[PDB]
Amino acid sequence: EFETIERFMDCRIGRKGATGATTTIYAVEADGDPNAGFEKNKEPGEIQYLIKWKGWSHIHNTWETEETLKQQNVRGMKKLDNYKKKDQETKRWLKNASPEDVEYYNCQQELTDDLHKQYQIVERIIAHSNQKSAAGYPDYYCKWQGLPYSECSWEDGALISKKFQACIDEYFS
């Protein structure tokens, strides 16, 4: 029973403890962002990485530290070392580059950020489970915006209904 890092999505100095399940986009929507109002130079912070997990869709991405990754015994830890290398190489480059380059870099980061956001949006629902929860919710097989059909995933119906009820209505139309 272990989790595997699929991809490092982002990196920040965040409030200590703002990691794990409370940082998913749906936890934040429901309960507020654990990193809200964090100001780097007035409160203790830590390096945190946004993780896309193998076998979990992008809505389940979480912020993690090197420490939490190790404590949870996740697989794919070689990707951390690679990420830290690329990051240090990128930061060296930024320090000298002409703002003409910095501009192009920033543009590619913004386009990338926008792409990543799409991955967390249900484009349409493809199928629903026969089994339903006590509360009557089936699970839903979801096609994600900007991802191919191979990246569809089963999702908790109660969770999907909080934000994508229109997709549900459309599927049952």
């Binding site: 794990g20 399940a21 998913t24 749906y26 936890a27 979990w56 389940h60 979480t62 489970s129 089994q131 699970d139 839903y140 089963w154 999702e155 908790d156 119906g157 969770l159």
Partner: peptide, 12 residues
């Protein structure tokens, strides 16, 4: 002991 086998989860 025979090893036996929903696909939907959430981060808890």
């Amino acid at each position: 002991p025979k090893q036996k086998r929903r696909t939907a989860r959430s981060k808890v």
